[PDB]
Amino acid sequence: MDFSRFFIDRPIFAAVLSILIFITGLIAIPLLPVSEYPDVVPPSVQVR
Amino acid sequence: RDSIRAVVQTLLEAVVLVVLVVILFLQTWRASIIPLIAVPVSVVGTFSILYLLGFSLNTLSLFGLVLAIGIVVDDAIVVVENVERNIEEGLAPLAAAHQAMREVSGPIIAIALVLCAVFVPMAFLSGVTGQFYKQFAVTIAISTVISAINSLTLSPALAALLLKPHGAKKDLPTRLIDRLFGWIFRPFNRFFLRSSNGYQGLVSKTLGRRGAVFAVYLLLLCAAGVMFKVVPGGFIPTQD
Amino acid sequence: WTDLSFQQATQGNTALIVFPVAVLLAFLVLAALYESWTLPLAVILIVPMTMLSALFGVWLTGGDNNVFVQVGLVVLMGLACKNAILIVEFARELEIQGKGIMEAALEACRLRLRPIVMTSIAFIAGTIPLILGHGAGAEVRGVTGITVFSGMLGVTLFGLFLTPVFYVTLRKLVTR
Numbered sequence: 532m533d534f535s536r537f538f539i540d541r542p543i544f545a546a547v548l549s550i551l552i553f554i555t556g557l558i559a560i561p562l563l564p565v566s567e568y569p570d571v572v573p574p575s576v577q578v579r
Numbered sequence: 580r581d582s583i584r585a586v587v588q589t590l591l592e593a594v595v596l597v598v599l600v601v602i603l604f605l606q607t608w609r610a611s612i613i614p615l616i617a618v619p620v621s622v623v624g625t626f627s628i629l630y631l632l633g634f635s636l637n638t639l640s641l642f643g644l645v646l647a648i649g650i651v652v653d654d655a656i657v658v659v660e661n662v663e664r665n666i667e668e669g670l671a672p673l674a675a676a677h678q679a680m681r682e683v684s685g686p687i688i689a690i691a692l693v694l695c696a697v698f699v700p701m702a703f704l705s706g707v708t709g710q711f712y713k714q715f716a717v718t719i720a721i722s723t724v725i726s727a728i729n730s731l732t733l734s735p736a737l738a739a740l741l742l743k744p745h746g747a748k749k750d751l752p753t754r755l756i757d758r759l760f761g762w763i764f765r766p767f768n769r770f771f772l773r774s775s776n777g778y779q780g781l782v783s784k785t786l787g788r789r790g791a792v793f794a795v796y797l798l799l800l801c802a803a804g805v806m807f808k809v810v811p812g813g814f815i816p817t818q819d
Numbered sequence: 820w821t822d823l824s825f826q827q828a829t830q831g832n833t834a835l836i837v838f839p840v841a842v843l844l845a846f847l848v849l850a851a852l853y854e855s856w857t858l859p860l861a862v863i864l865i866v867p868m869t870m871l872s873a874l875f876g877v878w879l880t881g882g883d884n885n886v887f888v889q890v891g892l893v894v895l896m897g898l899a900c901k902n903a904i905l906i907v908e909f910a911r912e913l914e915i916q917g918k919g920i921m922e923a924a925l926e927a928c929r930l931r932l933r934p935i936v937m938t939s940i941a942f943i944a945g946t947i948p949l950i951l952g953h954g955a956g957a958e959v960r961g962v963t964g965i966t967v968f969s970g971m972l973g974v975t976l977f978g979l980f981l982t983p984v985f986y987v988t989l990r991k992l993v994t995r
């Protein structure tokens with residue numbers, strides 16, 4: 532609770548931390564590939 | 580090859596000059612030691628991390644190293660300016676270092692963090708221009724982090740042991756510099772005092788006429804913009 | 820299109836989301852250090868001032884804003900950032916020790932005056948070897964050196980003068 536003790540007396544620090552997390556996620560979303568399902572289709576090789 | 584020699588030449592230069600500067604301001608052989616150790620082990624240490632991230636020595640990365648030695652020195656100076664200023668206000672060198680790092684320690688990690696905040700995103704720029712920026716940025720940022728670790732661990736400690744209380748006695752080294760190079764010590768220490776005093780006078784008046792300071796900063800930033808777009812753009816400059 | 824012209828024609832401009840993301844990121848860190856949403860602007864708002872100054876060296880010469888001088892510009896404004904950060908934190912801590920805002924900023928400038936000038940004079944003494952000497956890549960080393968001179972001059976002058984004005988201005992509209 533000394534962790535929380537430090538943070539409640541420094542609320543701007545807490546806001547900054549939550550905003551940093553939110554910002555990294557916000558810049559991550561456009562970078563992520565949009566598919567249906569994770570990659571589970573097994574790769575195959577054709578020999579002709 | 581030339582770039583390599585540059586990165587070593589400048590480094591030794593960066594040592595020599597910095598030690599001169601400290602003996603001019605913190606006039607003791609004691610303090611001059613510690614940036615002489617601080618700035619090499621930083622830049623050289625950079626190489627290790629540069630290896631782990633798969634980079635290579637090249638004109639651009641070594642250029643970034645040459646740029647980064649400067650912030651490395653700057654950290655060393657701030658640390659020992661503060662510790663010897665503690666000794667000046669009359670603290671034992673160990674307690675001097677304690678108070679000094681209480682004053683600037685958490686700052687230093689904050690400035691390392693903001694420097695990373697401005698430098699690391701440069702590695703994700705686009706275009707071959709961006710791939711050059713990437714070498715510059717990564718080299719500078721890892722040098723910043725290593726230099727901050729050095730400024731928080733080795734430099735303050737080495738100040739604590741190396742430096743003794745002010746006055747004490749100008750020792751063998753210190754007596755040598757005192758006699759030999761007291762040639763030009765005093766005139767410009769006292770000129771520095773007078774220039775200081777003028778400085779707080781100037782700020783004290785400007786802190787009264789803050790509206791005019793805002794008025795010049797305005798349209799100075801407009802000149803900055805027009806000049807950002809009239810000075811030629813940025814691409815790789817051709818060389819012999 | 821072909822070659823690097825083709826790469827230009829297909830590449831995007833991620834700087835338009837790299838520069839802002841950097842800026843506020845620094846802001847966020849400073850906001851945590853100062854415990855203030857406004858005190859960071861004491862540092863940030865002075866860094867475009869050094870840029871012009873450094874850039875002015877190129878206008879002195881007639882060179883170009885090639886990638887090397889661009890990274891040099893960013894580096895010197897980072898140095899300006901660190902100077903401003905340290906003096907601003909010193910002023911704020913002085914205020915926490917019972918001093919008024921204006922005398923705190925005055926005395927913070929007073930304490931930090933010496934380290935800034937010694938760092939800058941060390942650099943500007945290392946700058947003269949960066950307009951002559953021996954070795955190749957002369958265009959690169961030069962186009963960095965002239966800027967480095969003018970930019971360090973701007974760094975010191977505008978830190979030591981604007982940051983106290985910016986600090987006192989910013990802190991007057993939050994104490995009511």
Ligand SMILES: CCCCCCCCCCCCO[C@@H]1O[C@H](CO)[C@@H](O[C@H]2O[C@H](CO)[C@@H](O)[C@H](O)[C@H]2O)[C@H](O)[C@H]1O
Binds near residue numbers: 541
């Ligand atoms: C849709 C939202 C999605 C993005 C979410 C990101 C998380 C957002 C969290 C940040 C919340 C706002 O952050 C919060 O701002 C307030 C108001 O300025 C700060 O408060 C500050 O100003 C107030 C004045 O009102 C003072 O009383 C206080 O001492 C001071 O800390 C808080 O210390 C900070 O925690």
Ligand SMILES: CCCCCCCCCCCCO[C@@H]1O[C@H](CO)[C@@H](O[C@H]2O[C@H](CO)[C@@H](O)[C@H](O)[C@H]2O)[C@H](O)[C@H]1O
Binds near residue numbers: 696704837
């Ligand atoms: C506190 C320390 C700071 C550390 C924080 C680091 C923050 C880094 C964020 C930099 C800004 C994000 O910038 C992001 O760069 C990526 C590079 O992958 C760009 O991405 C671009 O190249 C990638 C990789 O080839 C492609 O997959 C993508 O389709 C394309 O848009 C994004 O368009 C941009 O959103």
